Amino acid sequence: MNNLKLDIVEQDDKAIVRVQGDIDAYNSSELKEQLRNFISTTSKKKIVLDLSSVSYMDSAGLGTLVVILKDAKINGKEFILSSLKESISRILKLTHLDKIFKITDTVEEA
C-alpha cells in the first residue's frame, strides 16, 4: 500500500525527483497526478526526473511522461529524465522520447 513515492529536491538549483516505485496502472495513475502537481510546485525550470527506482513501465507510464512534458511547457519549464535502467532506457528510445524530454545518465548530463 502507498508503494509509489516521489523524492523531490530543489535545494542545489535543480528540481531532482527520485521516483520510488515501478509503473503499471496501479502507480502510473498516481505518479501522473503527483508529477503534474510537482511541475506546478517546483520553482526550478530544470526538472530531472530520476528513474533510479523505476524498472517496469507500462503504456500508461509512457503516456504519463508525455503528460508531464505538456504540463512543463504550460509552466514554461524544461523537462529532463535521468537514471535509465535497461528496461526504462529502452522504453524512452522506443518512441524517440529521448529527444522530446532529453535524457541523462546522471546530474553531470542534466
CB 45 within 8 Å of CB 70: no
- CA-CA distance, 102 to 96, in Å (whole number)? 10
**DSSP label of 23:** B
Method: NMR
Helix H or strand E segment including 92: helix 86-93
Write the DSSP assignment of 46-78 as a string of letters: -EEEE-TT---B-HHHHHHHHHHHHHHHHTT--
User: Where in the sequence is the domain holding 61, given as residue range(s)?
Assistant: 1-110
3-state secondary structure of 35: helix
CATH label of the domain that carries residue 42: 3.30.750.24
Beta bridge partners of 23: 57
- CA-CA distance, 41 to 69, in Å (whole number)? 15
Provide CB contacts within 8 A for 47, sequence distance 6+: 15, 17, 38, 39, 72, 77, 78, 79, 80
Q: In the chain, how many domains are there?
A: 1
Q: How far is CA 101 from CA 11, 26, 68, 82, in A?
A: 22, 24, 10, 10
